Amino acid sequence: ELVKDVLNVLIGVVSATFSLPESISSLLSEVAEYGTCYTRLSHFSLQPKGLVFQAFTSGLRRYLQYYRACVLSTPPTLSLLTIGFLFKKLGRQLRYLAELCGVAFPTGVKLLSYLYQEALHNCSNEHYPVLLSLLKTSCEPYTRFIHDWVYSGVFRDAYGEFMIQVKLYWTHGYVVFLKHIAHDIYVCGKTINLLKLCVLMKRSITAPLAAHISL
Amino acid sequence: MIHELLLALSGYPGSIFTWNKRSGLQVSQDFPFLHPSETSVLNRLCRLGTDYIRFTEFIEQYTLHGIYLRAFCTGLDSVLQPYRQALLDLEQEFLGDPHLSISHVNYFLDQFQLLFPSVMVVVEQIKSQKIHGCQILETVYKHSCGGLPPVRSALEKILAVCHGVMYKQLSAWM
Amino acid sequence: GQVVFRLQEFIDEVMGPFRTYQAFMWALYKYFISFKEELAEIEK
């Protein structure tokens, strides 16, 4: 029936004709090469260097499972041509994710901003939600660092993903997101550390933030 | 060669249905399993497929740069959907009756025979004059006053999606 | 056949902005599809 063969390539398991008339091979290659990137992702996003790279790596697996969820769900045994047409509006999107990753690659803020410029570059198209759901979780740990100088003041660093590292007492060297708040965060923290010794509209960040800076 | 034909109409040619990067789909030569004066309709039917591949070869390459151009591509994916839908309908037919002839598909696939040649040249003007910027909103509108009701209702849909970019940038700016 | 071959030659020379001939063939073309269905059915 061959349908359980082609459908078992998007999963990665080899088959009788998938190793690692007569025109079907051309049709087979169009769904075959789709599989070669799915495997080329688990080989790349399997680990649990950088903290923000892990979250982006942890956000990617939150997506592939959906791709594994959609398959093995609808078709018990459908027509051969139905497979190629059904997995076209979705398959080409999988090949787009290869242009994003490698299959070098920035880290830290350099990556949290690179992924941002991928939004405005391809905003209105159908690639807006998937990239957004990545950026929405690829910045999750970075907000926590920012959530230190605003609430507690205990600077937290691991490998240098933060853009800021650590008489005069003011030698915490400092030198995308709106610079109107960039330099303000640098001073909104040093004050706390000193009292201890005595459309892309970024509104979800600055609104719970500026309310605390003035106070 | 029945199922051989439908796959050629989807973007996968074979030995009996050769492919050329210059001309397009065409019958190779004479076969003993086909009527001597039947090859005519297949060549005419193949011209429907030759347009389809040049669509995908243009869509996949996305080639010129700009959001309006890129969003015009995805807009071109919506209009081609009934072509994907109606072609798949024949599959249920021949699996049911295996003795059908080559004449029936031409009687079924006449509507798409006319829509492509009018919309295909719309792509040619873009690849030949480098229509960059919002001017694509007029080239689609200049042919929107066409006489054919189906051709009018097709490019109408692309305009309904192509404006989806302008409205957004207009909103985020105004 | 002459009556139908000449008309098919006419429709061909419009496909390959007059807005009238192009609007005239669409009426002729529409008649042919329905006429073709009766002939195609007989073949069944």
Curated annotation (Swiss-Prot), chain A:
Portion of the full sequence shown: 351 to 1498 of 1819
Quaternary structure annotation from Swiss-Prot or TrEMBL: Component of the gamma-tubulin ring complex (gTuRC) consisting of TUBGCP2, TUBGCP3, TUBGCP4, TUBGCP5 and TUBGCP6 and gamma-tubulin TUBG1 or TUBG2. TUBGCP2, TUBGCP3, TUBGCP4, TUBGCP5 and TUBGCP6 assemble in a 5:5:2:1:1 stoichiometry; each is associated with a gamma-tubulin, thereby arranging 14 gamma-tubulins in a helical manner. Gamma-tubulin at the first position is blocked by TUBGCP3 at the last position, allowing 13 protafilaments to grow into a microtubule.
Function: Component of the gamma-tubulin ring complex (gTuRC) which mediates microtubule nucleation. The gTuRC regulates the minus-end nucleation of alpha-beta tubulin heterodimers that grow into microtubule protafilaments, a critical step in centrosome duplication and spindle formation.
Disease in which the protein is involved: Microcephaly and chorioretinopathy, autosomal recessive, 1: A syndrome characterized by microcephaly, cognitive impairment, underdeveloped retina and choroid, and epilepsy in some patients. The more anterior parts of the retina, near the periphery and pars plana, have a grayish hue and diminutive vasculature similar to retinopathy of prematurity. Visual impairment becomes evident during the first year of life.
Protein family according to the UniProt entry: Belongs to the TUBGCP family.
Cellular compartments annotated: Cytoplasm, Cytoskeleton, Microtubule organizing center, Centrosome
Record-given protein name: Gamma-tubulin complex component 6
UniProtKB/Swiss-Prot annotation, chain B:
Regions annotated as coiled coil: none
Localization in the cell: Cytoplasm, Cytoskeleton, Microtubule organizing center, Centrosome
Tissue specificity note: Ubiquitously expressed.
Top-level taxon in the UniProt lineage: Eukaryota
Oligomer and partners: Component of the gamma-tubulin ring complex (gTuRC) consisting of TUBGCP2, TUBGCP3, TUBGCP4, TUBGCP5 and TUBGCP6 and gamma-tubulin TUBG1 or TUBG2. TUBGCP2, TUBGCP3, TUBGCP4, TUBGCP5 and TUBGCP6 assemble in a 5:5:2:1:1 stoichiometry; each is associated with a gamma-tubulin, thereby arranging 14 gamma-tubulins in a helical manner. Gamma-tubulin at the first position is blocked by TUBGCP3 at the last position, allowing 13 protafilaments to grow into a microtubule.
Function field: Component of the gamma-tubulin ring complex (gTuRC) which mediates microtubule nucleation. The gTuRC regulates the minus-end nucleation of alpha-beta tubulin heterodimers that grow into microtubule protafilaments, a critical step in centrosome duplication and spindle formation.
Family per similarity comment: Belongs to the TUBGCP family.
Clinical note on disease: Microcephaly and chorioretinopathy, autosomal recessive, 3: A disorder characterized by congenital microcephaly and chorioretinal dysplasia associated with poor vision and nystagmus. Variable ocular anomalies include microphthalmia, retinal folding, retinal detachment, optic nerve hypoplasia, absence of retinal vessels, round areas of chorioretinal atrophy, and attenuated electroretinogram. Most patients have mild developmental delay and mild learning difficulties.
Protein name: Gamma-tubulin complex component 4
Organism ancestry: Eukaryota, Metazoa, Chordata, Craniata, Vertebrata
Residues shown, of full length: 1 to 191 of 667
Swiss-Prot record, chain C:
Coiled-coil regions listed: none
UniProt note on tissues of expression: Widely expressed, with highest levels in heart and skeletal muscle and moderate levels in brain.
Subcellular location: Cytoplasm, Cytoskeleton, Microtubule organizing center, Centrosome
Stated family: Belongs to the TUBGCP family.
Assembly description: Component of the gamma-tubulin ring complex (gTuRC) consisting of TUBGCP2, TUBGCP3, TUBGCP4, TUBGCP5 and TUBGCP6 and gamma-tubulin TUBG1 or TUBG2. TUBGCP2, TUBGCP3, TUBGCP4, TUBGCP5 and TUBGCP6 assemble in a 5:5:2:1:1 stoichiometry; each is associated with a gamma-tubulin, thereby arranging 14 gamma-tubulins in a helical manner. Gamma-tubulin at the first position is blocked by TUBGCP3 at the last position, allowing 13 protafilaments to grow into a microtubule.
Described function: Component of the gamma-tubulin ring complex (gTuRC) which mediates microtubule nucleation. The gTuRC regulates the minus-end nucleation of alpha-beta tubulin heterodimers that grow into microtubule protafilaments, a critical step in centrosome duplication and spindle formation.
Name recorded for this polypeptide: Gamma-tubulin complex component 5
Higher taxonomy: Eukaryota, Metazoa, Chordata, Craniata, Vertebrata
Gene name per UniProt: TUBGCP5
